[PDB]
A paper describes a structure:
During bacterial cell growth, hydrolases cleave peptide cross-links between strands of the peptidoglycan sacculus to allow new strand insertion. The [name] carboxyl-terminal processing protease (CTP) [name] regulates some of these hydrolases by degrading them. [name] assembles as an inactive hexamer composed of a trimer-of-dimers, but its lipoprotein binding partner [name] activates [name] by an unknown mechanism.
We improved the map to an overall resolution of 3.9 Å. We found that the movements of the PDZ domain, the core domain, and the NDR of the active [name] in the [name]-bound [name] hexamer are comparable to those observed in the locally refined [name]–[name] dimer complex. These changes help maintain the trimer-of-dimers configuration of the [name] complex bound to three [name]. We found that the long loop (aa 376–411) that is disordered in the [name]-alone hexamer structure becomes ordered in the [name]–[name] complex structure, and we now call it the trans-interacting loop (TIL). Analysis of the structural features of TIL showed that the TIL Glu-385’ and Asn-394’ hydrogen bond with the active site His-84 and Gln-360, respectively. In addition to the polar interactions, the TIL residues Phe-383’ and Leu-388’ form a hydrophobic cluster with Phe-325 of the activated [name] and Pro-147 of the inactive PDZ. As the TIL is specific for [name] and is ordered only in the [name] hexamer bound to three [name], it is likely that the loop’s function is primarily related to the active [name] hexamer.
Numbering used by the authors:
A (entry chain E): 38 to 375, 414 to 436
B (entry chain G): 44 to 151
C (entry chain B): 370 to 436
D (entry chain F): 38 to 235
Write the structure that this text describes.
C-alpha cells in the first residue's frame, strides 16, 4: 500500500558503504549482511534471536537430544574432572564404568589443561565413531576403554518417593517426549505404590522451558477439564487454544507444585494452568514471569530464525509476561533448626501429609 | 569469490527486492533491469531476466537475456534463454551461435 | 518446636522486567521489578516453626478446597 | 571480475519481510532497519556504535558541567562487559573493583545484551547518587557492590622522592594537561636531587 521508505534504505546503504571502507579489516559483504540480520532480530525482543548454521543444531539438541554420545556426564569442579554418575541405558554403563572413574587420557589427550567445554566436545561426536580413553581407577594400572558413539536419549523426568504414599517428581527441561515420559513415570509410580498414593509433589524449580506442546501435554496428564492455556498473536495462525482432555491418570491425587525463579516459559505454563483451575497448590518464590511462544521458522542454508511469534494467557486471562505467577504458600528457601536436606521439599512434603490427614482419612 | 556491492547498486537492489516483496513488481522490475545494465553481473542479470519473464514483459526480457548471455556466455542456460528470446525477436544468426554453443555442451 | 532462620541471596535472578526492552504484559498491569526486599518488622510466622506450618497448611487447604 | 552476492541481499529482504509479518507488535520497517544497522555495527566491532542524530547532538556536549562519573573504564569482551581499569582516587577504586572484573548487572539490570556505549551511559549518573553493580572475578560467585557517584578529579601526575637519587612518578590517567605537567613535576625532582637522578 504505502510507498517503501527510501530514506531508511538510503541511510542503511550509506552506512554499509562507509563501514565496508573505513573499517580496519577486510570485511566481506556477506559478513556485513549477516550481522545486519542478527541485529534486526536480536534487538527487537530479548528472547528472539537469529540462529546460524551451527546453533540451530544446538537448539534441536536442547529440545530433543537424540544425540550420539557415550552416556557419561563429566563435571568440572575445582578444576578437576570427575563423573557424577554414568547415564542410564548407555553402552558406557554396560561397560562397567562407575561414578568417580578418572580418565587420565582422552584419545591420547591428557585431561590436565582441558576445559569443561573442550572435554564435552571431544567426548561428543557423530554416532559410530570409535573413541579410546585411558582411565585409572583407584590409582591402579591404567586401562584402555574403546567405545562407539550411539544415539542416547537423555532423561527428562525423575522421581523418588520420600515415604510410602508420598511421591516426588522432578522435571528438568521440557522436551518433545516429556509428556510420554511423565505419563510413564506416573504409571510406574502407581504400579510400585499398588496404584494408590497419598500425595504427589512436583519440582519445576530452575526449569527453563521447552516445547509448548509437551507442556500442554503434561498439563493434560494432570488436569482433566477446562482450557489449559491459549495464545494470542498478531498473526491469526499463531492463535491456538489448548484444552485438557477428559483422560486423566493422576486420579485427582493432591498436588503441590514448586515454582522457583528459574521456571520461565513451560514450567510457568504448567504452573499457571494448574493454579488457574484450583487443581494444585503453588509454592516457592515468584517465577521468571516471561510470556512468549516462539516459532523457529525454517530458512535456507540451515539458518532458521527464532521470533517471539505470540504471547500466551493463563485460563483466567491474566498475562504472565513481566509479572509472573505469585505462589500461594510463598515459602522462601531458608534453614530450619530445632527430604530433610531440601528445605523447600521438606515443607512441601509436610504440607501435603498434613492436608492428606486432615481430610479424606 | 564474491564481488563488493557498490553503494548505489546496493541501495537499488535492496529497494527492488523489498518492492518485489510488497507486490509492487513494477518498481522491482525497473530497478532490476537498470541495475543489471549498470553492473553487467551474471547473478543480477539472471534474476532480472526471471523477474521480467514472470511479469510477462518482453523488451525488458530481451534486454536482460542479452545482458545475461553477454556477461555469462559460459552458462548454457543463458545461451538457451538468449537464443529463444532473440528467435522471438527475429534475429537468428546469434541464435545460431547460441545453438552451436549448446551443441558443444550436452544439450539439444 | 523450632526456629526458621530466613536467609538472603547476594545475587538474585533477574526477572523478565529487567531485560532491556521487555514486552508489555497483555493485561497492561504494572510490571514487577527486582527491587530489594527488607521487611521493616519480621512477621511472626517466620519466627516459630509451628506457626509457619499451621499458616501454610491453612493456605493450602483453602486453595485446594476451592472455597 | 567476481559475482555480486545478490543471494545475500535476497535473504536479507526475505528475513525483513518475514520478521515484520510474524512479529507480535506492529513494527515499522524504520525500526527494523535501524536495528539492523545497530546490530551490524555492534557485532562487527564491540567498540563501535551508530550514534543517532539526537544522540550525536548529545555527543557534541555533555549535559552538565558538574556531571559526575563512577570512574570505572570498561571495554567489551566476548560480548560481555569487562572492567578494563578503575581509575585511581575514585569511589569505585575504594571498593574491591580490580582490573579483569566482569560486570554482570548495573543498577539491577542485565548488561549482557546491550552495547558498551549504552552500558557506560547507564553507569554514569548524578553526583552523589547511589548505584549498584554485580561483579564476577575469575569465575567466582557474582557478588553485589554498592557505590556512591561523585565528580572525579584525576589529580594528573603524582610525584615523590624515594631515595637520594631514586624518584617515583605515577601517571594516574592521561588527560589533556598531563602532557606538560610531567615535565614540570620532573623539574622539581631534578631540582631536589642536585640535577641528577640515579
Amino acid at each position: 500500500s504505502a510507498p517503501l521508505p527510501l530514506d531508511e534504505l538510503r541511510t542503511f546503504a550509506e552506512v554499509l558503504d562507509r563501514v565496508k571502507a573505513a573499517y580496519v579489516e577486510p570485511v566481506d559483504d556477506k559478513t556485513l549482511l549477516e550481522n545486519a540480520i542478527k541485529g534486526m532480530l536480536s534487538n527487537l525482543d530479548p528472547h528472539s534471536a537469529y540462529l546460524g548454521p551451527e546453533d540451530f543444531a544446538e537448539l534441536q539438541e536442547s529440545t530433543s537430544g537424540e544425540f550420539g554420545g557415550l552416556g557419561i556426564e563429566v563435571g568440572s569442579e575445582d578444576g578437576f574432572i570427575k563423573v557424577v554418575s554414568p547415564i542410564d541405558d548407555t553402552p558406557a554403563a554396560r561397560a562397567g564404568i562407575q561414578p568417580g572413574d578418572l580418565i587420565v587420557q582422552i584419545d591420547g589427550k591428557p585431561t590436565k589443561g582441558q576445559s569443561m567445554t573442550e572435554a564435552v566436545d571431544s567426548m561428543r561426536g557423530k554416532a559410530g565413531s570409535p573413541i579410546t580413553l585411558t582411565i585409572v581407577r583407584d590409582g591402579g594400572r591404567p586401562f584402555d576403554v574403546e567405545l562407539k558413539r550411539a544415539i542416547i536419549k537423555v532423561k527428562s523426568v525423575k522421581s523418588q518417593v520420600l515415604e510410602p504414599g508420598y511421591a516426588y517428581l522432578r522435571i528438568t527441561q521440557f522436551q518433545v517426549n516429556t509428556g510420554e515420559e511423565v505419563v510413564k513415570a506416573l504409571n510406574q509410580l502407581r504400579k510400585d505404590n499398588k496404584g494408590r498414593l497419598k500425595g504427589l509433589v512436583l519440582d519445576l524449580r530452575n526449569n527453563p522451558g521447552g516445547v509448548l506442546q509437551s507442556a500442554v501435554e503434561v498439563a493434560d496428564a494432570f488436569l482433566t477439564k477446562g482450557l489449559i492455556v491459549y495464545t494470542k498473536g498478531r498473526i491469526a495462525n499463531s492463535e491456538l487454544r489448548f484444552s485438557a482432555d477428559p483422560a486423566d491418570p493422576s486420579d485427582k491425587v493432591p498436588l503441590v507444585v514448586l515454582i522457583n525463579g528459574g521456571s520461565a516459559a513451560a514450567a510457568e505454563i504448567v504452573a499457571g494452568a494448574l493454579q488457574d483451575q484450583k487443581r494444585a497448590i503453588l509454592m516457592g518464590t515468584d517465577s521468571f514471569g516471561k510470556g512468549s511462544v516462539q516459532t523457529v521458522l525454517p530458512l535456507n542454508n540451515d539458518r532458521a530464525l527464532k521470533l517471539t511469534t505470540a504471547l500466551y494467557y493463563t485460563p483466567n486471562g491474566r498475562s504472565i509476561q513481566a509479572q509472573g505467577i505469585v505462589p500461594d504458600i510463598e515459602v522462601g528457601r531458608a534453614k530450619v533448626t530445632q527430604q530433610d536436606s531440601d528445605y523447600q521439599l521438606s515443607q512441601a512434603l509436610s504440607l501435603l501429609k498434613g492436608l492428606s490427614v486432615t481430610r479424606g482419612n | 569469490k564474491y564481488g563488493s556491492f557498490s553503494e548505489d547498486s546496493l541501495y537499488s537492489l535492496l529497494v527492488a527486492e523489498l518492492a518485489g516483496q510488497r507486490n509492487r513488481f513494477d518498481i522491482a522490475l525497473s530497478n532490476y533491469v537498470v541495475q543489471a545494465q549498470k553492473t553487467r553481473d551474471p547473478g543480477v542479470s539472471e534474476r532480472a531476466f526471471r523477474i521480467a519473464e514472470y511479469l510477462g514483459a518482453d523488451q525488458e526480457a530481451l534486454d536482460t537475456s542479452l545482458l545475461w548471455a553477454r556477461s555469462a556466455p559460459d552458462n548454457l542456460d543463458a545461451q538457451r534463454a538468449a537464443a529463444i528470446q532473440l528467435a522471438r525477436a527475429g534475429r537468428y544468426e546469434e541464435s545460431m551461435v547460441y545453438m552451436e554453443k549448446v551443441l558443444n555442451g550436452q544439450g539439444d | 518446636r523450632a526456629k526458621v532462620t530466613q536467609e538472603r541471596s547476594s545475587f538474585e535472578g533477574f526477572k523478565e522486567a529487567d531485560l532491556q526492552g521487555h514486552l508489555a504484559n497483555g493485561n497492561g498491569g504494572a510490571d514487577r521489578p527486582t527491587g530489594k526486599r527488607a521487611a521493616p518488622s519480621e512477621r511472626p510466622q517466620d519466627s516459630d516453626y509451628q506457626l509457619s506450618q499451621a499458616l501454610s497448611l491453612l493456605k493450602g487447604l483453602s486453595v485446594t478446597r476451592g472455597n
